[PDB]
Amino acid sequence: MSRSIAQMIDHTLLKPNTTEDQIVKLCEEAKEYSFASVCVNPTWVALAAQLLKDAPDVKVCTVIGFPLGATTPEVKAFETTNAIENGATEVDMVINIGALKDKQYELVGRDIQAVVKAAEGKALTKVIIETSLLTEEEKKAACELAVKAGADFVKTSTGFSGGGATAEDIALMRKVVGPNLGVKASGGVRDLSDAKAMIDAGATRIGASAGVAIVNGERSEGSY
Amino acid sequence: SIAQMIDHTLLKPNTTEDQIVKLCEEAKEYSFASVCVNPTWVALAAQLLKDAPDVKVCTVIGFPLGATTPEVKAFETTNAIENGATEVDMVINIGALKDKQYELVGRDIQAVVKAAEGKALTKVIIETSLLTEEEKKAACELAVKAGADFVKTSTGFSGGGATAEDIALMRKVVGPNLGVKASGGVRDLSDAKAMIDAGATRIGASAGVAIVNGER
């Protein structure tokens, strides 16, 4: 068909005070609209994997070393396999931003490789570079270390910093990784218009919380 | 006198190595109780403070959302202690507490406490800004039941920070058995003293220097 934008959306709910009923609603909405995945904190991975056990096209995405990215690589790897043991098949980790700003590139790559190795053959890895804290050169350097580390994806924002995704950065990241890794726009994507703008700039996945209203804008653009 | 109760804290995502150095040298100069740093900086802070045993290396566990498994909270606690930490500040599973899932909240705290057993003090951040008045009391009660050494107001990343009413409520629950740490929103000396009068034993702040120079 004319591919629904729903298949590119990671239904996301990461608030610190999220309760079980809200995760239940989030997984049911994803089963309904056939979102690309749900994105929940690691404590809800087991519940989401059970709720979506008969929905293979809807992955269970969790976040690693989130949202500050300022823990050790060994912790990020342990959380990754722990999440995978609990039923997660996609992981969005946060780079060590301070190590990147200090140009300690070997540790930034070592940090990403720890998650990649822990996920090898079991989960898709997304690397959150947190564009709002990086200069232009650090945005490209982080994407390059993601490519060398073997990640599957680069991701703009955690949604817990000073900004979200912009079309200029999505173009910027798509230029670095090319066709080899996916590019995900996240943080601030509120409407169908924003999501389409990121897709046009090169995004292959959208992290959002208003995914129900975004897809409802897809069925409502052709309404009579 | 006030400096021995302040955890000189810097937990920003883009904190660089030179700012951890500045943080430790201020901690030695003013003899703060500890430096609170993200786990990536524990090994460096411990080496910069080896010749200053009176100041401890404090880090944050399952920070700041507290929405990860107890298994990794324990791994991160054991990992931090291996890197030279002697105090850990963990965040409760807020969603589990709101869901009245008190056995998971308790077990999540005991995971950190058992990892730190005999090696590090455990502070339990309850995040007062997202809790009802009863959930604050319940969280402090589970902290005492799990063997925590402290109860802490906020992560500094949610709704609000420490209030004198919240400190007095938490001090009333833990009594003298556990410390009570005021963190978030304390900028001057006046706020610091206002929390201590309410029953605070430790203060978590960014501007520990600005607080100490108010008395000096």
Short mmCIF file of C-alpha atoms in Angstrom, two decimals:
data_model
loop_
_atom_site.label_atom_id
_atom_site.label_comp_id
_atom_site.label_asym_id
_atom_site.label_seq_id
_atom_site.Cartn_x
_atom_site.Cartn_y
_atom_site.Cartn_z
CA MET A 1 0.00 0.00 0.00
CA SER A 2 1.02 3.62 0.63
CA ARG A 3 3.04 2.69 3.70
CA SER A 4 1.53 4.01 6.91
CA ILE A 5 3.89 6.14 8.96
CA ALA A 6 2.83 3.93 11.89
CA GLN A 7 5.33 1.25 10.86
CA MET A 8 8.17 3.72 11.56
CA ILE A 9 7.02 4.88 15.02
CA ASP A 10 8.45 3.66 18.33
CA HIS A 11 5.52 4.09 20.70
CA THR A 12 7.43 5.60 23.59
CA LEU A 13 6.61 6.16 27.27
CA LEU A 14 9.59 6.72 29.58
CA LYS A 15 8.28 8.90 32.42
CA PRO A 16 9.74 8.03 35.86
CA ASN A 17 6.24 7.63 37.36
CA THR A 18 4.72 5.38 34.69
CA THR A 19 2.39 2.71 36.07
CA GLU A 20 1.42 -0.76 34.91
CA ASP A 21 -1.95 0.23 33.45
CA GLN A 22 -0.28 2.85 31.25
CA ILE A 23 2.12 0.23 29.87
CA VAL A 24 -0.90 -2.00 29.22
CA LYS A 25 -2.59 0.79 27.25
CA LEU A 26 0.63 1.55 25.35
CA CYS A 27 1.08 -2.06 24.21
CA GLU A 28 -2.58 -2.33 23.18
CA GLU A 29 -2.30 0.84 21.09
CA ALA A 30 0.81 -0.58 19.40
CA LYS A 31 -0.95 -3.88 18.66
CA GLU A 32 -3.79 -1.81 17.19
CA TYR A 33 -1.85 0.59 14.94
CA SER A 34 1.00 -1.92 14.35
CA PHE A 35 3.68 0.52 15.46
CA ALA A 36 7.31 -0.40 14.83
CA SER A 37 7.75 -1.02 18.56
CA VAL A 38 6.95 0.11 22.07
CA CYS A 39 9.77 1.86 23.92
CA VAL A 40 9.61 1.39 27.70
CA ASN A 41 12.08 1.59 30.57
CA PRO A 42 13.87 -1.69 31.40
CA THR A 43 11.57 -2.40 34.37
CA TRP A 44 8.62 -2.90 31.98
CA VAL A 45 10.38 -5.08 29.37
CA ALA A 46 9.04 -8.35 30.76
CA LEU A 47 5.46 -7.04 30.82
CA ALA A 48 5.62 -5.61 27.30
CA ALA A 49 7.11 -8.80 25.86
CA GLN A 50 4.23 -10.78 27.38
CA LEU A 51 1.54 -8.33 26.22
CA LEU A 52 3.02 -8.41 22.69
CA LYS A 53 3.87 -12.13 22.70
CA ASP A 54 1.43 -12.73 19.81
CA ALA A 55 2.45 -9.50 18.01
CA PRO A 56 5.77 -10.41 16.36
CA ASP A 57 5.79 -7.32 14.11
CA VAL A 58 5.78 -5.09 17.23
CA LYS A 59 9.17 -5.15 18.94
CA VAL A 60 9.94 -4.50 22.60
CA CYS A 61 12.36 -1.58 22.74
CA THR A 62 14.10 -0.43 25.93
CA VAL A 63 16.72 2.18 26.80
CA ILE A 64 20.26 1.54 28.08
CA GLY A 65 22.24 3.85 30.35
CA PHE A 66 19.28 6.27 29.90
CA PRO A 67 18.92 9.19 29.86
CA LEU A 68 22.30 10.52 31.08
CA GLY A 69 24.64 7.99 29.41
CA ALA A 70 27.16 8.65 32.19
CA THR A 71 27.63 5.13 33.57
CA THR A 72 30.37 2.63 32.80
CA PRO A 73 30.41 0.40 29.68
CA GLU A 74 30.20 -2.72 31.88
CA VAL A 75 26.92 -1.48 33.36
CA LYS A 76 25.50 -0.64 29.92
CA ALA A 77 26.39 -4.13 28.68
CA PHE A 78 24.86 -5.85 31.74
CA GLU A 79 21.67 -3.83 31.40
CA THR A 80 21.55 -4.74 27.70
CA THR A 81 21.74 -8.52 28.13
CA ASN A 82 19.50 -8.28 31.21
CA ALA A 83 16.92 -6.48 29.07
CA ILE A 84 17.39 -9.04 26.28
CA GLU A 85 16.88 -11.86 28.78
CA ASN A 86 13.68 -10.09 29.85
CA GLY A 87 12.33 -9.97 26.28
CA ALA A 88 13.71 -6.85 24.59
CA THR A 89 14.70 -7.11 20.92
CA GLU A 90 15.72 -3.45 20.43
CA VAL A 91 17.91 -1.28 22.67
CA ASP A 92 18.47 2.49 22.51
CA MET A 93 21.63 3.37 24.46
CA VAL A 94 23.00 6.81 25.31
CA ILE A 95 26.62 7.60 24.46
CA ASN A 96 29.11 8.82 27.05
CA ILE A 97 28.65 12.48 26.13
CA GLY A 98 31.34 13.74 28.49
CA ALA A 99 33.90 11.34 27.06
CA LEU A 100 32.98 12.54 23.57
CA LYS A 101 33.33 16.22 24.51
CA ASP A 102 36.74 15.39 25.99
CA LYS A 103 37.62 13.69 22.66
CA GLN A 104 38.11 10.33 24.41
CA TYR A 105 36.88 8.63 21.26
CA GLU A 106 38.30 5.22 22.15
CA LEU A 107 36.08 5.02 25.24
CA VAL A 108 33.03 6.37 23.41
CA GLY A 109 33.46 3.59 20.87
CA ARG A 110 34.35 1.05 23.54
CA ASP A 111 31.15 2.13 25.33
CA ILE A 112 29.00 1.56 22.23
CA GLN A 113 30.74 -1.71 21.33
CA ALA A 114 29.89 -3.08 24.79
CA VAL A 115 26.18 -2.72 24.05
CA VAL A 116 26.58 -3.95 20.45
CA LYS A 117 28.45 -7.08 21.54
CA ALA A 118 25.87 -7.79 24.25
CA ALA A 119 23.09 -7.42 21.65
CA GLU A 120 24.89 -9.29 18.86
CA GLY A 121 22.39 -11.42 16.98
CA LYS A 122 19.64 -10.82 19.54
CA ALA A 123 18.71 -7.13 19.53
CA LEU A 124 18.83 -4.07 17.30
CA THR A 125 20.98 -1.28 18.77
CA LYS A 126 20.24 2.44 18.51
CA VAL A 127 22.88 4.97 19.56
CA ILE A 128 21.48 8.16 21.12
CA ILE A 129 23.99 10.96 20.54
CA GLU A 130 21.84 13.68 22.23
CA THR A 131 22.22 16.33 19.53
CA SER A 132 21.22 19.21 21.82
CA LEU A 133 24.49 18.88 23.79
CA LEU A 134 26.88 18.32 20.86
CA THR A 135 28.67 20.66 18.49
CA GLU A 136 28.49 20.01 14.76
CA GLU A 137 31.77 18.07 14.70
CA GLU A 138 30.78 15.97 17.73
CA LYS A 139 27.52 14.99 16.02
CA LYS A 140 29.50 13.55 13.09
CA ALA A 141 32.18 11.98 15.31
CA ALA A 142 29.54 10.16 17.36
CA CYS A 143 27.84 8.79 14.24
CA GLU A 144 31.20 7.59 12.91
CA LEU A 145 31.98 5.76 16.16
CA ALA A 146 28.51 4.18 15.94
CA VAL A 147 29.28 2.90 12.43
CA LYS A 148 32.64 1.45 13.48
CA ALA A 149 31.12 -0.08 16.63
CA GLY A 150 28.57 -2.02 14.59
CA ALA A 151 25.44 -0.29 15.84
CA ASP A 152 22.29 -0.50 13.72
CA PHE A 153 20.96 3.01 14.29
CA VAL A 154 21.79 6.56 15.28
CA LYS A 155 19.21 8.49 17.32
CA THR A 156 18.96 12.23 17.96
CA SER A 157 17.62 12.87 21.45
CA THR A 158 16.69 11.28 24.74
CA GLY A 159 13.83 13.72 25.23
CA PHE A 160 15.25 14.60 28.67
CA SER A 161 17.77 17.26 27.51
CA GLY A 162 17.47 20.76 26.07
CA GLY A 163 16.13 19.90 22.63
CA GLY A 164 14.75 17.31 20.27
CA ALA A 165 15.20 16.26 16.66
CA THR A 166 15.83 18.80 13.89
CA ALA A 167 15.80 18.16 10.15
CA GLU A 168 19.31 19.61 9.75
CA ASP A 169 20.77 17.06 12.17
CA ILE A 170 18.86 14.15 10.60
CA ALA A 171 20.33 15.17 7.25
CA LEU A 172 23.66 15.48 9.06
CA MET A 173 23.49 11.95 10.48
CA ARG A 174 22.11 10.39 7.29
CA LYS A 175 25.11 11.86 5.47
CA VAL A 176 27.61 10.24 7.84
CA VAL A 177 26.11 6.75 8.10
CA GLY A 178 24.65 6.65 4.58
CA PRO A 179 22.39 3.66 3.90
CA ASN A 180 24.22 1.33 6.30
CA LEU A 181 22.62 2.35 9.62
CA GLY A 182 19.13 3.61 10.27
CA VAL A 183 18.48 7.16 11.49
CA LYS A 184 15.85 7.82 14.16
CA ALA A 185 14.27 11.18 14.99
CA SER A 186 13.13 11.53 18.59
CA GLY A 187 12.22 14.21 21.09
CA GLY A 188 9.86 17.03 20.16
CA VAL A 189 8.14 15.18 17.29
CA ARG A 190 4.57 16.17 18.17
CA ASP A 191 2.48 16.07 14.97
CA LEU A 192 2.32 14.24 11.65
CA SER A 193 3.89 17.32 10.06
CA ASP A 194 7.01 17.10 12.24
CA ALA A 195 7.31 13.36 11.63
CA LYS A 196 7.03 13.80 7.86
CA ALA A 197 9.68 16.53 8.01
CA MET A 198 12.15 14.21 9.74
CA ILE A 199 11.38 11.38 7.31
CA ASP A 200 12.00 13.72 4.38
CA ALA A 201 15.35 14.71 5.92
CA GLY A 202 16.41 11.05 6.03
CA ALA A 203 14.85 9.42 9.11
CA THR A 204 13.85 5.74 9.03
CA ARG A 205 12.34 5.62 12.53
CA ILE A 206 10.40 8.07 14.69
CA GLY A 207 10.39 8.15 18.48
CA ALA A 208 7.24 9.83 19.73
CA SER A 209 4.52 9.74 22.35
CA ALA A 210 1.66 11.15 20.22
CA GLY A 211 1.82 8.23 17.77
CA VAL A 212 -1.93 7.68 18.02
CA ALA A 213 -2.67 11.26 16.96
CA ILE A 214 0.00 11.12 14.25
CA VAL A 215 -1.50 8.05 12.56
CA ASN A 216 -5.00 9.45 13.12
CA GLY A 217 -3.74 12.38 11.06
CA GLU A 218 -2.86 9.92 8.29
CA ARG A 219 -6.33 8.53 8.00
CA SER A 220 -7.76 12.06 8.37
CA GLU A 221 -5.72 13.63 5.55
CA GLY A 222 -7.77 11.74 2.96
CA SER A 223 -11.09 12.16 4.76
CA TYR A 224 -13.95 13.69 2.81
CA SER B 1 31.00 23.20 60.26
CA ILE B 2 28.39 23.09 57.50
CA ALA B 3 30.83 21.72 54.92
CA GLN B 4 31.05 18.30 56.58
CA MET B 5 27.38 17.70 55.67
CA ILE B 6 27.48 18.67 51.97
CA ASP B 7 27.80 16.22 49.09
CA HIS B 8 29.50 18.41 46.48
CA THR B 9 27.53 17.30 43.43
CA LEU B 10 27.84 17.52 39.65
CA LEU B 11 25.74 15.03 37.66
CA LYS B 12 25.25 16.81 34.33
CA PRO B 13 25.19 14.62 31.17
CA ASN B 14 27.94 16.63 29.41
CA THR B 15 30.20 17.03 32.46
CA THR B 16 33.83 16.97 31.32
CA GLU B 17 36.96 15.66 33.00
CA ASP B 18 38.26 19.10 34.00
CA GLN B 19 35.03 19.85 35.87
CA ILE B 20 35.40 16.65 37.90
CA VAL B 21 38.93 17.82 38.75
CA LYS B 22 37.62 21.23 39.83
CA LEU B 23 34.92 19.46 41.85
CA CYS B 24 37.39 17.30 43.78
CA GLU B 25 39.82 20.15 44.52
CA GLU B 26 36.97 22.23 45.94
CA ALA B 27 35.94 19.21 48.03
CA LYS B 28 39.47 18.99 49.45
CA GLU B 29 39.71 22.75 49.95
CA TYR B 30 36.41 23.02 51.83
CA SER B 31 36.47 19.45 53.23
CA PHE B 32 33.01 18.56 51.94
CA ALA B 33 31.52 15.27 53.10
CA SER B 34 31.76 13.77 49.60
CA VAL B 35 31.69 14.39 45.86
CA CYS B 36 28.60 13.10 44.07
CA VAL B 37 29.51 12.12 40.50
CA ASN B 38 28.09 9.89 37.80
CA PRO B 39 29.48 6.33 37.74
CA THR B 40 31.76 7.05 34.76
CA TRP B 41 33.76 9.42 37.01
CA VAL B 42 34.08 7.27 40.15
CA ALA B 43 37.50 5.81 39.33
CA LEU B 44 38.94 9.24 38.54
CA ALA B 45 37.46 10.98 41.59
CA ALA B 46 38.71 8.21 43.89
CA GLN B 47 42.27 8.66 42.59
CA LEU B 48 42.08 12.46 42.88
CA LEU B 49 40.89 12.06 46.50
CA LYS B 50 43.15 9.18 47.59
CA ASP B 51 45.18 11.56 49.79
CA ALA B 52 41.91 12.95 51.26
CA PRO B 53 40.17 10.03 53.00
CA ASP B 54 37.83 12.34 54.95
CA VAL B 55 35.98 13.11 51.67
CA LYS B 56 34.19 10.19 50.05
CA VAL B 57 33.39 9.35 46.44
CA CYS B 58 29.62 9.20 46.05
CA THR B 59 27.78 8.10 42.92
CA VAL B 60 24.22 7.58 41.74
CA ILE B 61 22.54 4.21 41.12
CA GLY B 62 19.71 3.65 38.64
CA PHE B 63 19.80 7.46 38.28
CA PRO B 64 17.73 9.50 37.72
CA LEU B 65 14.60 7.59 36.64
CA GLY B 66 14.93 4.53 38.89
CA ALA B 67 12.98 2.56 36.26
CA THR B 68 15.47 -0.26 35.64
CA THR B 69 15.75 -3.75 37.08
CA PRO B 70 17.09 -4.51 40.57
CA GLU B 71 19.66 -6.82 38.94
CA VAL B 72 21.36 -3.98 37.08
CA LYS B 73 20.94 -1.60 40.03
CA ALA B 74 22.92 -4.17 42.03
CA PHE B 75 25.49 -4.65 39.25
CA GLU B 76 25.95 -0.88 38.96
CA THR B 77 26.32 -0.67 42.75
CA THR B 78 28.93 -3.44 42.87
CA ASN B 79 30.64 -1.86 39.84
CA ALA B 80 30.73 1.58 41.47
CA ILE B 81 32.21 0.16 44.67
CA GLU B 82 34.88 -1.66 42.65
CA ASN B 83 35.76 1.68 41.03
CA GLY B 84 36.25 3.34 44.42
CA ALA B 85 32.83 4.53 45.58
CA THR B 86 31.94 4.35 49.27
CA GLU B 87 28.46 5.93 49.10
CA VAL B 88 25.69 5.29 46.56
CA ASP B 89 22.48 7.25 45.98
CA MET B 90 19.83 5.08 44.32
CA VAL B 91 16.42 5.99 42.91
CA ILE B 92 13.39 3.93 43.92
CA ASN B 93 11.13 2.32 41.33
CA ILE B 94 8.56 5.12 41.42
CA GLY B 95 6.07 3.32 39.19
CA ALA B 96 6.14 0.26 41.43
CA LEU B 97 5.47 2.39 44.52
CA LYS B 98 2.54 4.18 42.86
CA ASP B 99 1.22 0.75 41.85
CA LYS B 100 1.35 -0.26 45.55
CA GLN B 101 3.84 -2.97 44.50
CA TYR B 102 5.68 -2.66 47.79
CA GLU B 103 7.47 -6.02 47.53
CA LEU B 104 9.23 -4.96 44.32
CA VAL B 105 10.04 -1.53 45.78
CA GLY B 106 11.53 -3.21 48.84
CA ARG B 107 13.38 -5.90 46.89
CA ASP B 108 14.75 -3.23 44.54
CA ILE B 109 16.27 -1.36 47.49
CA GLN B 110 17.62 -4.52 49.13
CA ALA B 111 19.41 -5.32 45.87
CA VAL B 112 21.53 -2.17 46.24
CA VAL B 113 21.90 -2.55 50.02
CA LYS B 114 23.17 -6.13 49.77
CA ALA B 115 25.67 -5.09 47.10
CA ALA B 116 26.90 -2.23 49.31
CA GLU B 117 26.85 -4.37 52.48
CA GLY B 118 29.92 -3.54 54.54
CA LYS B 119 31.43 -1.44 51.75
CA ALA B 120 29.27 1.61 51.06
CA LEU B 121 26.48 3.71 52.51
CA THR B 122 23.17 3.57 50.63
CA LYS B 123 20.96 6.62 50.17
CA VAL B 124 17.47 5.97 48.81
CA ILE B 125 16.12 8.81 46.65
CA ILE B 126 12.33 8.70 46.91
CA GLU B 127 11.70 11.62 44.50
CA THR B 128 9.25 13.61 46.64
CA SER B 129 7.86 15.67 43.75
CA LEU B 130 6.04 12.70 42.17
CA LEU B 131 4.69 11.15 45.40
CA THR B 132 1.59 11.64 47.50
CA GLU B 133 2.10 12.35 51.19
CA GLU B 134 1.42 8.69 52.02
CA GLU B 135 3.76 7.37 49.32
CA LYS B 136 6.55 9.44 50.88
CA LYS B 137 6.02 7.75 54.24
CA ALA B 138 5.71 4.30 52.65
CA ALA B 139 8.94 4.73 50.68
CA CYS B 140 10.84 5.75 53.82
CA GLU B 141 9.41 2.74 55.66
CA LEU B 142 10.57 0.34 52.94
CA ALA B 143 14.00 2.00 53.08
CA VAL B 144 14.32 1.22 56.79
CA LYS B 145 13.04 -2.32 56.21
CA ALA B 146 15.64 -2.92 53.47
CA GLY B 147 18.67 -1.66 55.40
CA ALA B 148 19.28 1.67 53.70
CA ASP B 149 21.43 4.16 55.61
CA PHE B 150 19.72 7.32 54.29
CA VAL B 151 16.61 8.73 52.65
CA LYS B 152 16.98 11.43 50.01
CA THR B 153 14.54 14.03 48.69
CA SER B 154 15.03 14.40 44.95
CA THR B 155 17.16 13.49 41.95
CA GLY B 156 17.27 17.09 40.76
CA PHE B 157 15.67 15.97 37.48
CA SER B 158 11.93 15.95 38.29
CA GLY B 159 9.07 18.14 39.52
CA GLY B 160 10.83 19.90 42.38
CA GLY B 161 13.33 19.64 45.19
CA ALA B 162 13.71 19.44 48.96
CA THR B 163 11.14 21.16 51.18
CA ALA B 164 11.30 21.59 54.95
CA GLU B 165 7.93 19.84 55.32
CA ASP B 166 9.21 16.81 53.40
CA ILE B 167 12.38 16.59 55.50
CA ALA B 168 10.40 16.65 58.76
CA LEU B 169 8.07 13.94 57.44
CA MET B 170 10.96 11.68 56.41
CA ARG B 171 12.85 12.34 59.66
CA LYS B 172 9.70 11.38 61.55
CA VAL B 173 9.60 8.02 59.77
CA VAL B 174 13.27 7.04 60.00
CA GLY B 175 13.80 8.55 63.45
CA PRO B 176 17.48 8.59 64.40
CA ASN B 177 18.24 5.25 62.72
CA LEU B 178 18.78 6.62 59.19
CA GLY B 179 20.10 9.91 57.90
CA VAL B 180 17.91 12.25 55.86
CA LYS B 181 19.48 14.01 52.87
CA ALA B 182 18.09 17.25 51.44
CA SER B 183 18.87 17.66 47.74
CA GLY B 184 17.56 19.82 44.93
CA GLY B 185 16.80 23.52 45.14
CA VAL B 186 19.19 24.34 48.00
CA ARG B 187 21.29 27.23 46.67
CA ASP B 188 22.16 29.55 49.57
CA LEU B 189 23.09 28.90 53.19
CA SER B 190 19.55 29.86 54.22
CA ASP B 191 18.02 26.89 52.38
CA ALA B 192 20.72 24.57 53.75
CA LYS B 193 20.03 25.66 57.32
CA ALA B 194 16.28 25.47 56.72
CA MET B 195 16.60 21.80 55.75
CA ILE B 196 18.83 20.95 58.72
CA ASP B 197 16.41 22.52 61.21
CA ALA B 198 13.80 20.29 59.60
CA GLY B 199 16.00 17.29 60.42
CA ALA B 200 18.42 16.94 57.48
CA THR B 201 21.74 15.18 58.09
CA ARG B 202 23.31 15.68 54.65
CA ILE B 203 22.89 18.28 51.91
CA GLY B 204 23.25 17.60 48.20
CA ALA B 205 24.03 20.76 46.28
CA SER B 206 25.86 22.12 43.25
CA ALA B 207 27.08 25.36 44.85
CA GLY B 208 28.61 24.00 48.02
CA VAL B 209 31.16 26.82 47.79
CA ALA B 210 28.43 29.48 47.69
CA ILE B 211 26.77 27.86 50.72
CA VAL B 212 29.93 27.60 52.83
CA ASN B 213 31.09 31.17 52.16
CA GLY B 214 27.78 32.38 53.60
CA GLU B 215 28.91 31.31 57.08
CA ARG B 216 32.54 32.34 56.53
#
